[PDB]
UniProtKB/Swiss-Prot annotation:
GO terms for biological process: catabolic process. Transmembrane segments: none annotated. Belongs to the cytochrome P450 family. Heme binds at H84, R88, R294, Y317, A347, H350, C352. Keywords: Aromatic hydrocarbons catabolism, Heme, Iron, Metal-binding, Monooxygenase, Oxidoreductase. Its EC number is 1.14.14.-. Monomer. Forms a heterodimer with GcoB. Part of a two-component P450 system that efficiently O-demethylates diverse aromatic substrates such as guaiacol and a wide variety of lignin-derived monomers. Is likely involved in lignin degradation, allowing Amycolatopsis sp. ATCC 39116 to catabolize plant biomass. GcoA binds and processes the substrate with electrons supplied by the GcoB subunit. GO terms for molecular function: heme binding; iron ion binding; monooxygenase activity; oxidoreductase activity, acting on paired donors, with incorporation or reduction of molecular oxygen. This is Aromatic O-demethylase, cytochrome P450 subunit. Its cofactor is heme b.
Length: 403
């Protein structure tokens, strides 16, 4: 429709998944709010527009089309009003900073050690599969009450949900171009139900300290629980993003550090710099790159575009975090970048609920890794490929060290 952006008609889903940064560099200059045909939606690409939409009184949450097809209702990310308030009150207790501080070290550090012990003497490893993902899912899985679900299984589930939720491509008529791509999301949900339904059966009668048990019981009248159909979509939200993203963030941080060997040495020497390293890692390759959205509730003008009521806008926070209006040479990882606001945790009433927890998981994981393997080196025989438009991170991270 917009004539000067006719080139967007030729952007493909595969291109965006392999590397979205060239398209979005053009969008940030040409059209900070732009309709992207293959995505079937307006996309916000700059920090100013993403923050405005995410915080505007004239927008509310909406799930992406493929997200809705996968998760259904009421996913915490796609609802508003009283239901959203209830789901936030449901998830927030275990994520409160004073609560996290009571137990985060005893949760994550033994897990990180357990996975590290399996390879720390090998001289080689693929850190995504052998460390970053397992620590992320085992930590959250235990908190949730999924101790008996193997980390291999939790990792398979968030891979399948990832592909289903980001199966966004639409055809000439605005219909999903790849409908068969939702089948593995449906199969993941069926497997999750088979595992989690018995656990919920038990928690209803025998509550414990698991987070899901508290989701069922907290704030409810005596003898009542939240219906499982009311909480399952948020369970799925967790089994995707909350399981995947801390692993993504640690891995991207390491890749960035490896790209700046002088900076990797600083952080290994001085582990108090790990939080700063992680913050730059999240800006540099945002794990949740473009997975959430808002919808206008009345006619509104954003970045010169007159939007009718009912218009969805995807928030490409990963692009916003490369806004050259804010950052110098944003495509380069720089630990010594001045600490500035970023949008990797979103903004507004639907901003990330688990920031404090996530930052500690990533921190502890990197602390233990650098303690166990101070001479870590990237395996330069294998390149690092990043994949993902909706969620983005490295597909593998081959490293070596002198044993
Ligand atoms: C580095 C790791 C993580 C990153 C980068 C991340 C980022 C985000 C982003 C971008 C959103 C959408 C915000 C928006 O639409 O404005 C979000 C939502 C959310 N995240 Fe995080 N997340 C991470 C880890 C986690 C973890 C571990 C948990 C739970 C233990 C969690 C819980 C949630 C919840 C519940 C929401 C939905 C909030 C709502 O819609 O009201 N996140 N996250
Ligand atoms: C915490 O998990 C998520 C956060 C934001 C988006 C999604 C899925 O679109 C998630 O699963």
């Amino acid at each position: 429709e917009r004539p000067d952006l006719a080139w967007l008609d030729e952007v493909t889903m595969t291109q965006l998944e392999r590397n979205p940064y060239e398209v979005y560099e053009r969008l940030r200059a040409e059209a900070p709010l732009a309709f992207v045909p293959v995505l079937g939606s307006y996309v916000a690409s700059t920090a100013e527009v993403c923050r405005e939409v995410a915080t505007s009184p004239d927008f509310e949450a909406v799930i992406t089309p493929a997200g809705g097809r996968t998760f259904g209702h009421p996913a915490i990310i796609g609802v508003n009003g009283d239901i959203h308030a209830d789901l936030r009150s449901m998830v927030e207790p275990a994520l409160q900073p004073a609560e996290v501080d009571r137990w985060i070290d005893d949760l994550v550090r033994p897990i990180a050690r357990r996975y590290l012990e399996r390879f720390e003497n090998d001289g080689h490893a693929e850190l995504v599969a052998q460390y970053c993902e397992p620590v992320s899912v085992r930590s959250l899985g235990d908190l949730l009450g999924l101790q008996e679900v193997d980390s291999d299984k939790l990792r398979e589930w968030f891979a399948k949900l990832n592909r289903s939720v980001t199966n966004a491509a639409v055809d000439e008529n605005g219909e999903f171009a790849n409908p068969e791509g939702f089948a593995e999301g449906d199969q993941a949900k069926a497997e999750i139900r088979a595992v989690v339904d018995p656990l919920i059966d038990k928690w209803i009668e025998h509550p414990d300290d698991s987070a899901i048990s508290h989701w069922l019981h907290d704030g409810m009248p005596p003898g009542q629980t939240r219906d499982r159909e009311y909480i399952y979509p948020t369970i799925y939200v967790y089994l995707l993003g909350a399981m995947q993203e801390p692993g993504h963030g640690m891995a991207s941080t390491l890749v960035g550090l490896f790209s700046r060997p002088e900076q990797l040495e600083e952080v290994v020497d001085d582990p108090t710099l790990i939080p700063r390293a992680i913050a730059e890692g999240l800006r540099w390759t945002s794990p949740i790159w473009s997975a959430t959205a808002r919808i206008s509730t009345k006619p509104v003008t954003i970045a010169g575009v007159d939007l009718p009521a009912g218009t969805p806008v995807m928030l490409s926070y990963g692009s916003a975090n490369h806004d050259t209006g804010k950052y110098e040479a944003p495509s380069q990882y720089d630990l010594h970048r001045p600490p500035l606001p970023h949008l990797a945790f979103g903004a507004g009433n639907h901003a990330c609920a688990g920031i404090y927890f996530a930052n500690h998981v990533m921190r502890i994981a990197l602390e233990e890794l650098f303690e166990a393997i101070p001479n870590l080196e990237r395996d330069t025989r294998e390149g690092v490929e990043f994949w993902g438009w909706g969620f983005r991170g490295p597909t593998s991270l081959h490293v070596t060290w002198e044993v």
